Amino acid sequence: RGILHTQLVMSVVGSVQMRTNNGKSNQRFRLNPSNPALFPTLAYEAANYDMYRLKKLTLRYVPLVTVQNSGRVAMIWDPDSQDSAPQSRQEISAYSRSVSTAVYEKCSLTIPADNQWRFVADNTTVDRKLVDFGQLLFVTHSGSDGIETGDIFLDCEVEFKGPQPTASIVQKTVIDLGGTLTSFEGPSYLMPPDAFITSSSFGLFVDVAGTYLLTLVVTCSTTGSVTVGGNSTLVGDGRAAYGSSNYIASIVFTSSGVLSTTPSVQFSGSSGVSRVQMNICRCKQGNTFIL
Amino acid sequence: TPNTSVKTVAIPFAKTQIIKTVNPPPILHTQLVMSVVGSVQMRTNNGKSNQRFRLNPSNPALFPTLAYEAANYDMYRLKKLTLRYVPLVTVQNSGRVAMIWDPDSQDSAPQSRQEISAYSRSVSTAVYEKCSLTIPADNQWRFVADNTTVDRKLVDFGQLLFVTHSGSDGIETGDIFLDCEVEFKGPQPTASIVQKTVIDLGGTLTSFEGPSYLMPPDAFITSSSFGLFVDVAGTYLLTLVVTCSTTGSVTVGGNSTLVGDGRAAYGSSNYIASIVFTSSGVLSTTPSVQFSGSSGVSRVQMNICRCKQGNTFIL
Amino acid sequence: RGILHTQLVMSVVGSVQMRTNNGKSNQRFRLNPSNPALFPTLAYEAANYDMYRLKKLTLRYVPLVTVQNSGRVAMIWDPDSQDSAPQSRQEISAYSRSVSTAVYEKCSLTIPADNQWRFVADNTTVDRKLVDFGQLLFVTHSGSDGIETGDIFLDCEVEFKGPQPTASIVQKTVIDLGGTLTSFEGPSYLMPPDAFITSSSFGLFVDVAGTYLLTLVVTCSTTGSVTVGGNSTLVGDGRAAYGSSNYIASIVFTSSGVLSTTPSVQFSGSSGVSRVQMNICRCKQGNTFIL
Amino acid sequence: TPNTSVKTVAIPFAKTQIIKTVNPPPILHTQLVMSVVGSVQMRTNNGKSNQRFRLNPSNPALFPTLAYEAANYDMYRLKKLTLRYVPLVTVQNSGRVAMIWDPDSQDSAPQSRQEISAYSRSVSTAVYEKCSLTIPADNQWRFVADNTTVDRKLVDFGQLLFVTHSGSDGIETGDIFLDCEVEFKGPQPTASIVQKTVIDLGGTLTSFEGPSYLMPPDAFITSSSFGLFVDVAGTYLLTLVVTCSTTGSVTVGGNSTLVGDGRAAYGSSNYIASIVFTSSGVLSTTPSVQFSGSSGVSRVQMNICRCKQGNTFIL
Amino acid sequence: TTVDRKLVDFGQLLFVTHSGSDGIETGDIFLDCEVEFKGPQPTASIVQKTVIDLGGTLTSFEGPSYLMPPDAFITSSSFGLFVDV
Ligand SMILES: [Ca+2]
Ligand SMILES: [Ca+2]
Ligand SMILES: [Ca+2]
Ligand SMILES: [Ca+2]
C-alpha cells in the first residue's frame, strides 16, 4: 500500500464580489506533482522523476474563523487544465465534481483517479492539457472580505515511474520596466502577475506559504532599503550590500499564503530600476546571516 | 441520486465537556498539560521552549505525578496516547489550535503555516470546537532519562507541539488533556530529583544530575544581572550560588510569587540565596526569578526541588 | 433512611494564573461537621455531638455565568487532611477522586464513605489527619478573573453518636499590631489570613456567605467610622459608641462569599489601634438595632 | 475503565419552549405567574411582597381564574405541582434564577446567598437555561381562605419564592409557569370578592372581607400624601375614602394607567374617589395609585373589584 | 509530620546485642515485606528541614525522617551531626 500525504494548498480568503483562485489566474492549481502550490512536499520528490500516476485524491477544506462571517467556499475539479476560470457565481453547478458550502463548516470532495502514466512538467510544454490531470478551482462569494476563512488540505497517494537527474528547485525571474515576471529553469513559486517595478521602487507578492531565500540582483543607480511585511516577517538578519550599478541583497522570510494589499517583499527609495533578477529556494530558519 | 445532496448542519453555540474522576484496585490517567492561550501572529508551545513537551515519564511537564514513580524504574513503554483538547469558549472567537506529534524528539517547531497541517499525525481544528488526536504505540522498551544523555532521540518517544495562530489573543481559550497507560520494567534504587544547572557568560544552561525542570532556552546572564523563566507550574525551592563581586537583590517576577521569606546572604566571592516561589507556567515578559544589581556575574549554579509551602525559611 | 442536606460551599471565582481554595489556605475545607464552610447548617447540629459518620457525599458544581468566560473548575478530594495544597496546574490528575471541567458546565463527584466513627473537632487537636475524613480542594485556571463563575453544592447523610453540651457557636478573635487573627473557643468562621490592622485602620474579609453579628472592641485613642462594603451590605442599623480607650460597635451585615479586593468590614479614621476583639454569631435580619 | 472519562457537551445557543393549548369534557392547568426580571444585587419575588405567592386557590397571583370558582367551595387539595421556568434569552446574558417552595407560608425570604440553595426543595440553574421543579403533594383537606384568618400557616400549602441575583439587570429574562390539579369539597354560597383595607397613621394595611389583592407591605400614608403599589396585574375598580381636611388630586403611576375618566368629589371630612386602572405587575419606583396634595390624612378605606374597561364613569 | 506517630506506624524493631564479641562484623539483618498502597498523592517533598536552637534538639519539618532528634548537638561555638542512614 501507498503512503498518504496531507498537504496545505491555500489559506482561503473570503471575498465580497466574486473571486477565483484568489489573486491568481487559472494556471496555479495544475494537477502535476511539479507544482509547489498543490504539492509543497512532493515537489521535492517530483524533481527526481518523469512519470507519475495518482491513486487517491481528497480535498479537505477545514475552517478557521468563528461562525459569524457568512461565505461560500467552493472546490471544483476540471478534467481539463486549459479551460478558463469560471466567470459568474452561477457557473459553478455546471462542473462535474464540486462541493460548495458555507465558510464556517468543513467539507470533503473525492476525485476519481485514472490509471494512465503522465509526464511530470519540467518545461515549457505548450499543451498542459495532455500532461496535467486537471485543474482545481476555488471560489468565494458572499462577503467577509479581508478575513482568513479557512485552509484547504489535500491528500495523495502518488507513485512515480522512471527516474531523472534532479530538476533544479530554484526559480530565476527577470523583470524589465513595463515587463512582467518571466520564469527561467523552473519551478513555479512565483506567477507572472506577482510583481511590479517603477522607476524607483519594487515589490513581490508571495502566496505559497513557505520560508524562502531571495537573492535580489537589482540594477539601480542609488541604494535602497528593503522592507518585509504584509504577509511575511523577516527572520531578521537581512544583509544587503552595494557596490557598482548592481544592488545585491539576501533575505530570509516566512510567508503565510494569505492575500494582502501590501507587497510581501518591497524595495524602495532608490532611483532608475531597470532589471530585477531573483532566485528563490524554500530554505529553513537556520539559513540566515549573522550580523 | 439527483447528483446534489443537500445536508444541513446546525452549529449550536458553545460546546463544552465535563470531566469526572472515579477513581476506583491499589491504568488510564488523564492530566492537564496546558491552558491554550491564543495568539494573533504565530506561536508554538505557547511561549515555552522548543523542546518542552517530550515523551518520557521523567518529564515534569507531561507527568508531574508519575515522575516520582518513574525514578524507581529504568524501562518504560507507552500503550495508549490520546490528546483531547477541550474548548472553554463560545462560537464567537476565531482562531486555530493544532496538536502535533513528532517521532523525533529533537526537531524544531514551525515557524510557518506550511508545517502545521501535514506533519505526520496532526489535528488542526478551530478554537471553539473540540479535537481528539490519537498516537499509535510501539512495543519497544526505552530508557527512562536518568544521568542525562545527549542524543535524547533514542530515549524519548516524541514531542508534542501545540501550535496556535490567528486569534483571539491572550485569552483562556481551551485546555489540553493527555492519557497514558505507562508500564515500567526493572527497578532502580531511585533517581536524584534535584537539578544542577550551570551558566557561563555567553553560554546557556547545561543541566546535570536530572530531571528537566529548566531547559537551556530559559535563562540569561549578563555582566550584572540574571533571570530565569520557570515554565513548569509548581512550587519550587532554589539555591542560587552566583559568583559575583558585589551583593544584589532577588525579585520574583510575573510567572510566580514568593512565599515571602526568601533569606539570602553575601560573604566571599559567592552569593548564596534560597527562594521558595510558586509558578503558574503562563507567559509573562518578565523573568520569573530575577537577580540584578550586582557586578561581574560569571557562574550561576542551581538546585531545584519542588517543595511545598512549608519548606520556607523563617525571619 | 437518612435525610439529605444540600449545602452551599463556595461561590467559585475564576482566576487567570492558578489558584487553590480561592483566597485561603489548605485548612478551610476539612471534612468535619464542625466546619461552617462545608456545613453551614449542620454545624448547629454538630455542636451537640462528639462522633459522626458520613454516609453519602456528592459535589455538585452548578454554573451561573454565561458561556463566554472560559475556565476550568476542578473539585478534588484527599484522604489526608494535612497534605499541602496542590502546587501546579498539572498536579491535579495525580489525585484519586477528581472532576475538572469548564466553568460553564455542571459536574458531579461522588465520594465513597467509610464506616468509622470519628471525632467532631471542638479543639485544638494537633493531628487533624486522624480526625477529619479529608480535604476538598477547588482549583480554577484559565482566565475570567473577577467573575462569579458558579457555586458548589454538597449533599450529605450524617449520623451522630453520643451527645455533648453545646459547643459555643460564637467566635472570639484577637489581633495585635504585627499579629494575625487567633481564634478562641471556636468555630472557624474566620481564618487567620483574613484581617489586617495598621496604626490607624482595620479590615476583615468574610467569605463564608452568611448574615452575621459583630461586636467590635477596638482599643484606640480617637473615634472612627465603620464602613461595610465589597462583599457585604449593611442591614443598615449599625450603632456604635465611644467612651474610654475602648471603641465598641455592633454590626449586622450579610456577606456573599465572593472574593473582592476591598475588606468586607472596614474601620478607618482613628489613631493608635492596638487590639481588636471580635465576636461573630451568624444571626438573622431581625437582630438589628433600631435608631 | 481507563479511569478518566472524557464526555463532550455541545452547548448550542438559545433554547426556548413552545406552549400550545388544546384544550379538549365540560385537570391540569398551566398559567403564567411572572416574567422574571433579573437584577444585579439580590432580589426575592421581584420587588413584590415577602408573602405574595402563597398556595391557596383564593390567591389572585397564582390563580386569577380559579379564584372565582374557589369562592364557591370550602376545602381544597393540590394534586400535581410543577414549576416550569422557560427562558427567553440566548447564551449571552449571565445570571441565576432559583425557584423555592416552603412548607411554611409565613417565613421571610433570603436575604442571603446562603439560603437560596438548600431550602428543602429548590432548583437554581442559570438564566438562559430551563428549569423544572416538582412539589410533592399531600392528602389533607385545607380551608379556602375566606373571612381572613390570622395564622395562615395551617390554611395555605406553602410559598413560592423565585430568587434572582447577579444579572443581567432589568430585562425580560424568562417567565414562570405553574401547573395544578385542584379539587374542591363541600360548597359555599359564595365569597365576597371585594377587599376592604384600612390604614391609620403609622400603621399598615389591615385587610377585611377578603381576597388578597393588596398585602400589608404595599401602601404608605403620610400627613399629606398616599400611595399604593398594586402588583397583581389586572384591571381594577377603586373607591378611595380618605379622611382629610382639604381636597387633593389622584394620579396613576408607573405600574398602571387610567381608563381616563376617574371621577372624584369632595364634601365633608371624607374624600371619595372611584378609579379604574390597569396594572402590569412590573416594578416601578413610583406608587401605582397616588393621592397627594391634601392635609391631615388619617384613614384610607378601600374597595377593589377587578372590573373590565366598561365599568368606568363618564364625563 | 504528625506528632503522635503511634497511630500511624506499625511498630518498632529493636535489635539488641550484648556480651560479645566486641566491634566485629558479626551478622546482618534482612527484612521482607509485601506492601500495598491505597489512594495516591501528587508527591511528598523528599527534603528534610530541621532546626536547632541553643539547648533544644532537632525539630523536623516537611519530612522524611533522615535525621532524628537525638542526632545533633550545638554549642556556643561548634556544631555536629551523627548521620546514621
Ligand atoms: Ca523530465
Ligand atoms: Ca524530524
Ligand atoms: Ca467534644
Ligand atoms: Ca419555616
UniProtKB/Swiss-Prot annotation, chains A, C:
List every stretch annotated S domain, virion shell: 1-160
Q: Where is this region: P domain, projecting?
A: 161-291
Task: List the Gene3D superfamilies.
Answer: 2.60.120.20, 2.60.40.4030
- List where in the cell it is found: Virion
Q: Which UniProt keywords apply?
A: Capsid protein, RNA-binding, T=3 icosahedral capsid protein, Virion
GO terms (molecular function) for this protein are: RNA binding; structural molecule activity
Where it mainly occurs, coarsely classed, is: virion
Q: What is known of its domains?
A: The N-terminal R domain is rich in basic residues and is essential for RNA-binding and virion assembly functions.
The subunit field of the Swiss-Prot or TrEMBL record says: Homomultimer.
What this protein is reported to do is described as: Capsid protein self-assembles to form an icosahedral capsid with a T=3 symmetry, about 31-34 nm in diameter, and consisting of 180 capsid proteins. Plays an essential role in virion formation by interacting, via its N-terminal region, with the bipartite viral RNA genome and specifically with the 3' terminus of RNA-1 and the TA element on RNA-2. Also participates in symptom development, viral RNA accumulation and systemic movement within the host.
Question: What family does the entry list?
Answer: Belongs to the icosahedral plant coat protein family.
Q: What protein name is recorded for this chain?
A: Capsid protein
Q: Which organism is it from?
A: Red clover necrotic mosaic virus
Curated annotation (Swiss-Prot), chain E:
Subcellular localization, per the record? Virion
- Which terms in the GO cellular component ontology are assigned? T=3 icosahedral viral capsid
Q: Which GO terms describe its molecular function?
A: RNA binding; structural molecule activity
Q: Does the keyword RNA-binding apply?
A: yes
Protein family per UniProt? Belongs to the icosahedral plant coat protein family.
What is written about domains in the entry's comments? The N-terminal R domain is rich in basic residues and is essential for RNA-binding and virion assembly functions.
Q: What is this protein called?
A: Capsid protein
Q: What is the lineage of its organism?
A: Viruses, Riboviria, Orthornavirae, Kitrinoviricota, Tolucaviricetes
What fragment of the whole protein does this chain represent? 171 to 255 of 339
